[model samples]
Target: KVFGRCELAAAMKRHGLDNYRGYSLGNWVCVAKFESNFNTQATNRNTDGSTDYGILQINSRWWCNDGRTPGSRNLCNIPCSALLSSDITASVNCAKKIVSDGNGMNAWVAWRNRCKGTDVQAWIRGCRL
Candidate 1:
């Protein structure tokens, strides 16, 4: 399911995405916008035969187990299918690990491409949370 901006914003707040590891909530918000358009079930199959799953597009090659990506590190120790749920808890928790284990928020290329050096406030503007 696709999320409305305010709804996703509110959810992210409740899940503790605010200033996570020095990255603002807007950075995560913008990553979802460009990575998966806030669609909980979105998946992108990569040329390397890895798959990126769910709203934040956690990669199966390193972050999750999709059963299809060869050498799946399953770093988050979660089934990639877990991220497809609209609850977003699994995706959010796994993303936190990716950030902590690797390059902070830069674990997401979408974040690097879209939010890097940019004012992310536009993504959070008008959100009730």
Candidate 2:
């Protein structure tokens, strides 16, 4: 789904993303914006040959098992297809795992380059959290 800005915010909040691991709801929303534009089925193949899936683009390399990625950890213990579900429950759950796994939000290149140290609160402006 291509979420309207605040709609995504509400979704993330309901899933407990508000300040998860010190990253604010704004941070999560910002990552979603640049990562997949809030598209649930979004997928991207990394140069490392792993694929990223879902709204936050969970990686096949370490997060989900895509079977095609070499040496996948599958820490989430879920199929990569689960990440693409429009429900987004699996995606958010896996994302919380990714952050707690010591990567923080830095796991996302989009967050490092675009969402980091920026006015990410603007992404949620005028939206009732």
Candidate 3:
């Protein structure tokens, strides 16, 4: 499911991601924009042969299982398909675990490449919450 920017912001806020694990909401917004453009069902096959799932694009190699990807650690203990649903609760929980694991937002190449050092305030410009 795809979401408008403001709608996604509201959802994230409701999920407590606006201040989750000390990561800024603007940063999360930036990551979501670059990772999957806020499309909950988005998936991408990495060059390493692992697949990414959901709006946050959590990877199958460590976080979840896609069945097609072998050697998956399934650290999040969730089916990869769960991340593909419009309901973002599971994905958000998994993301919190990921960031709390020491990688922080650096786990996402999109965050490193696109959001790092950039002013992310624009991501939440008109959204009040």
Candidate 4:
């Protein structure tokens, strides 16, 4: 698990995601916090038989192959398990692609439901970025 929000923000900044794809760093941090609580190995089975993987909670139905779903879109071209690693490169890259695909932060339900129209600065407050 990540030690704190500051550390996670630093890592994301180092990965060039501090302010990427027209989304603020605070928004990304909010996504991470609400989606998986910054746990790299986090996974949640959806009611639709698809699972969300890793810190971003990417859907197995469209983004990654979890082996449970045979005909996944696999747009990320990486296994869902790859997203579960401590190395967040693959997940971050996939997230960027998702945003560039015109989804923006709206791609994530957590962002849409919880972070949208909210004061996101709290997600990065006191974090030396």
Candidate 5:
């Protein structure tokens, strides 16, 4: 479905990122694709669509730490959910949190390696181009 590309780009733009890649957008997409096949309407059959929710496959129950609100749905609450939601700022921040946490994009790097046929070293390869 990938309906959030524009919104995603908007989010990155707000952060002065210029474009995606090395900005969490790539990793977010990789994680979404790995978890939910990039399907916004996707629901986990195991949890009855409860475990991983929305574009980021965010766990509504565990990620409920931010509280619940329709507007807060997607990445606003859990940060990662913003990957699919209309709020690009929140999504970009969420991605920043993960990247700056010293994980150094490992979560995204691993996901990209599997889904995008990339490797850890290649994750940032887009920056050179």
Candidate 6:
């Protein structure tokens, strides 16, 4: 079960795409699978030359002040250690609110549907096999 607010937020972001009001572990699993195969340490450089970092594959520039828009800080601008902290569920939940203004979950749903071309939960279960 969800441990606390942080897990809840991670759950929301992972499953809900940090959008929907509620959370679902199944959704989180689906996103994790699609994004990084549940590898928290996963990192990748997209074709666009942008990087997807950590478990959620968060873009550093979008959430960290160390690159691109230098000096300017927003809610996404945070240190990797802080973002990837063991206590990151809370940070992610906080980030979800700041970055997507609460629409990330819906965006996740859309991405899942488009990618799997089927019901998200069903697709995820199938993928698990």
Write down the lDDT of every candidate, Cα atoms only: 0.90, 0.91, 0.89, 0.87, 0.46, 0.48
Model number with the top lDDT: 2
> Model 6 lDDT vs. the true structure?
0.48
Please list the Cα RMSD from the true structure of every candidate, rounded to 1 decimal place: 0.9, 0.9, 1.0, 1.2, 6.8, 6.7
Model 6 misplaced regions, further than 4 Å: 1-23, 68-74, 84-91, 106-110, 113-118, 122-129
Worst 10 residues of 4 by lDDT: 1-10
TM-score of 5: 0.44
Model 4: how large is the Cα RMSD against the reference? 1.2
Clashes of each: 0, 0, 0, 0, 3, 7
Tens-digit lDDT track of model 3 for 1-129: 898888888888899898787777888889999999999989999887899999999999999988887777899999999999998999998998898888788988889999989998789899976
Per-candidate TM-scores read 0.96, 0.96, 0.95, 0.93, 0.44, 0.53
TM-score of 6: 0.53
TM-score of 3: 0.95
**What are the clashing pairs of model 6?**
15-27, 15-28, 16-105, 17-104, 17-105, 19-105, 63-76
Model 2 spans > 4 angstroms off? none
Candidate 3, which ten residues in sequence have the lowest lDDT sum? 16-25
Per-residue alpha-carbon lDDT of candidate 6 for residues 23-82, written as tens digits (9 for 90 to 100): 334445455456655555566665555555555556554555335444434456465445
What TM-score would candidate 4 get against the native?
0.93
lDDT of 3 at 62: 94
Mind giving the per-residue lDDT tens digits that candidate 1 earns over 8-126? 98898899989888888888889999999999999999999999999999999998887888777988999999999989999999988888975898888878887989989889999
lDDT of 4 by residue, 44-69 (tens): 99887889999999999899988897
Which of the predicted structures, 4 or 5, would earn the higher TM-score when compared with the native?
Answer: 4
